[PDB]
Amino acid sequence: TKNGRDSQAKRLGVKRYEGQVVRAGNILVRQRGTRFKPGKNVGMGRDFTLFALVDGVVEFQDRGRLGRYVHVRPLA
Amino acid sequence: PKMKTHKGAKKRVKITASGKVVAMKTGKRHLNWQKSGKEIRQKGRKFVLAKPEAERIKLLLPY
Amino acid sequence: LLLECTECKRRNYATEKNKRNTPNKLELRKYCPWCRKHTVHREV
Amino acid sequence: GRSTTLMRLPKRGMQGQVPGEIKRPRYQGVNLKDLARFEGEVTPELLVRAGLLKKGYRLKILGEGEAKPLKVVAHAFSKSALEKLKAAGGEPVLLEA
RNA sequence: AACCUGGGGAACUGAAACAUCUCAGUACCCAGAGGAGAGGAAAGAGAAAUCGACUCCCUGAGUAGCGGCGAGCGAAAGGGGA
RNA sequence: AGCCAUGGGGGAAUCUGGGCGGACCACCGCCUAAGGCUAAGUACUCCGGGUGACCGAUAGCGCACCAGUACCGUGAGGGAAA
RNA sequence: GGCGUGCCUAUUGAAGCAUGAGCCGGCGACUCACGGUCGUGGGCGAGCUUAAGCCGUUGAGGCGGAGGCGUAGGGAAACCGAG
RNA sequence: GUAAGAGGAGGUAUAGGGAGCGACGCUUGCCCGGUGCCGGAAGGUCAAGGGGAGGGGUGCAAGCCCCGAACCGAAGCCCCGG
RNA sequence: GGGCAGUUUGACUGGGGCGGUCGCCUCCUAAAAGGUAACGGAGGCGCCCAAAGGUCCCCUCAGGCGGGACGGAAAUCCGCCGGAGAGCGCAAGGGUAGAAGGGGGCCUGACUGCGAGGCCUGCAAGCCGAGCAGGGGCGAAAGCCGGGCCUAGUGAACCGGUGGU
């Protein structure tokens, strides 16, 4: 009865909520396509992994048609 | 009497001055083909184990 | 196919992939050998 | 019943032919700071005669601290110990074989 | 009685199956030896232009190494003593 | 994969000889095969003696006792109680 | 008169119509060696410690450093060395 | 049965071994591709060995030591046929 | 070469056997973090590309309607409308034209040497990556490049093959 299969859950979503201290270059969001994007000091790589380019706090902005970005404001 | 240092152990692990068991990374010697340079490099490393790491030190000691 | 390119004037190598049938008869791409810096390579 | 973790792989090659272990000198590291304790003309003999050596024959005075203005006969120095010691007294190399 | 040398020589068993391996040259069978037996004057040991018959104890040392490099197996010189 | 040992085949030399030093070659070193005997240290405990943070009759040897008996088995063998 | 479903075991679950025991007495089951790894009580401490034996004792201990663990690590090694 | 040997049989194919069916009457059909068995001086394949173009290690060299193509190599299987 | 000998002859499983399945990706079941089971409901992978990679530059769909020799519902052309119902190698999903889609030019960073910090996690493993050094590539520069929009396309270790240092 070919029907007993499924995929090793990849455990995605955001991993650092707005207002949170992030160290130099740790991960923020592991997403499917483009539910999120880079932002002030927020690079990403092949799988669409948003992370920090510096330390500082994480924050979530909402720009309708333009989508959703997630950036970090640092303190130095 | 007089336990034997597991030979198959020491032939692939070394225990450090501190006491943590350093081990050789697995996944490079066969799976290869065109594994991104970034691959076969990050594999050339050694590293640490954990809870089995303590099982290891149990297998030697005379050494 | 499974392929590894070799260096001219020497014998360096690198990881690669051939395709045979499709447009892949000749293969002389550039790289970055160790002994010195930068030269051409081959097939087989 | 799976595989211990014997998945970790041998690297310790040069693990052994069939004869085995080769007749090679075995230089003994010993910090000059551990030497500068007692004084005089220290030699391998006078060294094992204390509590650092245990018949490794080859000795290798080295390390850090404060050398002494003494003579320290030895089988091998370190470019470090050598100079601090030159800034102290004297130091003869090994005998020979 | 046991111990000893030689001639033969198991499987259970362990490998969490099981063939190599292990159990082991053990069990046992046989022949021979004596208060012992065996071993013994180097076609030796092995890296010191050096040790110097043999036997045993301690050590070297779970080391060198052997092993479906798995289970596991396991020396020698040298040193200490008889 | 040397060395010691040897079932099968070929098959020397008498020191300007032969072996060994871990495939092999060269140098350099070790050694005298293909004959034989050798005390001692060593093991053992039927036997006798000593002793025990050993037993004290369901223990201690199976047997403190008329026990390798009674008795069971064709037989090897097993095997008490007291 | 009130109240009251044996024991062990095995179990999600037992008085259980699951297990085992007629009764009493005796016998009966986590030990020992060697090596580990903790902990602990001590002794000594850049040192600690002997193994076999030798001498002595006839319940008397002592000598014996061979060796062992420790003082430097890294590295497959050559090597280098608070790197 | 390791062998010596023994049965076979002090028998000799009108005999002995194995096999299946199972007094006696009438019968016992076609399939040989698979398998088995029998047959087939070729051929293909095939081991040890034989052979030594070529080349390796080494030595100052002579030499020594190793790897090794062609070719020659049985049963067996493949192939043909019953 | 069953004459004889030692062995193997898997697990899951509303008993077992037969049957079916065993690893990897996608969605659901999954109860708005993650995780989450059943012989639950449905499908995919064991690849493919030197162009499908890089970078600079340029351009933007499918669909509809109207006209248009072949053509004809649909080739190709233009007008008009068309925020994504297209496309993006292949299942699905998320995603995407304010490009990741389509064409062209030059090229090959389908780099070597490391790796800050995290994701995930029993282990092992998998995953993301700023930045440094050398040496380059496309670009006027800014810059971008450690393969492909991403998520399957896979195998500890042992034992061996060839190359070099």
Side-chain angles (χ1 to χ4, degrees):
Chain A
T1 57
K2 19 65 182 176
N3 249 341
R5 285 152 297 185
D6 198 39
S7 61
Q8 194 62 15
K10 300 212 167 302
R11 319 171 191 273
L12 314 70
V14 180
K15 309 302 176 181
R16 252 63 232 255
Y17 301 154
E18 177 167 18
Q20 194 159 24
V21 180
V22 289
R23 225 226 164 287
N26 37 30
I27 289 180
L28 319 173
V29 186
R30 268 171 180 249
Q31 59 179 332
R32 307 159 173 178
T34 308
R35 308 178 76 98
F36 301 85
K37 285 198 177 182
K40 300 170 307 157
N41 305 322
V42 172
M44 55 155 270
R46 298 217 297 99
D47 58 354
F48 298 113
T49 284
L50 312 185
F51 57 92
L53 297 182
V54 289
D55 299 38
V57 192
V58 176
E59 52 183 10
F60 285 61
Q61 195 177 95
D62 187 26
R63 305 212 295 179
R65 309 179 220 187
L66 292 171
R68 316 169 67 194
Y69 309 87
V70 172
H71 14 241
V72 176
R73 59 173 182 178
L75 302 81
Chain B
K2 193 191 188 188
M3 324 173 298
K4 304 176 179 189
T5 35
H6 183 334
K7 285 304 159 181
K10 187 178 72 293
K11 282 176 177 66
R12 82 193 65 196
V13 183
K14 187 179 174 177
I15 166 185
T16 50
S18 147
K20 42 197 203 183
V21 154
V22 163
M24 268 301 307
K25 261 296 206 314
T26 99
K28 65 165 310 170
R29 178 86 309 210
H30 174 17
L31 87 175
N32 224 313
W33 67 318
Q34 182 199 100
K35 294 185 62 61
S36 49
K38 168 189 170 182
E39 266 282 34
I40 45 81
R41 287 187 289 94
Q42 296 181 98
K43 286 281 189 52
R45 307 182 313 165
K46 325 207 257 194
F47 69 121
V48 264
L49 297 63
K51 286 42 267 160
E53 224 182 18
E55 293 191 323
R56 215 88 315 97
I57 317 181
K58 283 283 184 182
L59 298 145
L60 313 76
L61 297 163
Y63 228 89
Chain C
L1 196 143
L2 288 308
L3 212 285
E4 11 270 351
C5 308
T6 199
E7 174 196 357
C8 284
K9 269 277 80 179
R10 208 156 312 122
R11 290 163 300 194
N12 171 258
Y13 281 94
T15 61
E16 241 292 78
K17 280 182 55 184
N18 224 18
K19 296 304 171 183
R20 209 64 171 277
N21 281 119
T22 51
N24 276 89
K25 303 299 194 304
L26 50 294
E27 171 79 24
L28 48 161
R29 263 60 182 181
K30 194 160 297 184
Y31 202 56
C32 173
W34 221 166
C35 225
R36 293 126 176 174
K37 280 291 184 179
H38 270 255
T39 45
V40 294
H41 291 67
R42 294 302 167 180
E43 195 181 333
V44 69
Chain D
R2 56 189 185 202
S3 352
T4 39
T5 0
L6 195 126
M7 302 162 56
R8 14 73 177 174
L9 26 289
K11 108 169 303 293
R12 274 73 195 181
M14 195 93 304
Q15 73 156 30
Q17 244 52 11
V18 129
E21 182 64 45
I22 355 75
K23 176 71 179 188
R24 48 191 34 169
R26 303 177 285 174
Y27 299 97
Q28 153 95 153
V30 38
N31 217 277
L32 61 72
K33 69 161 302 303
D34 301 326
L35 182 64
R37 174 178 51 213
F38 57 91
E39 209 166 14
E41 194 185 75
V42 307
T43 58
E45 184 60 59
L46 276 60
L47 257 303
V48 51
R49 189 129 291 279
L52 331 75
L53 218 297
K54 228 59 181 179
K55 292 163 183 174
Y57 195 62
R58 305 309 165 86
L59 186 150
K60 204 177 181 82
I61 27 73
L62 41 55
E64 8 73 281
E66 274 293 63
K68 239 59 180 179
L70 83 177
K71 238 175 183 60
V72 46
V73 177
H75 287 339
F77 291 56
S78 168
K79 285 78 172 188
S80 59
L82 206 284
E83 318 311 333
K84 304 188 176 186
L85 168 49
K86 242 188 192 59
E91 36 87 15
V93 68
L94 54 69
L95 359 298
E96 195 68 11

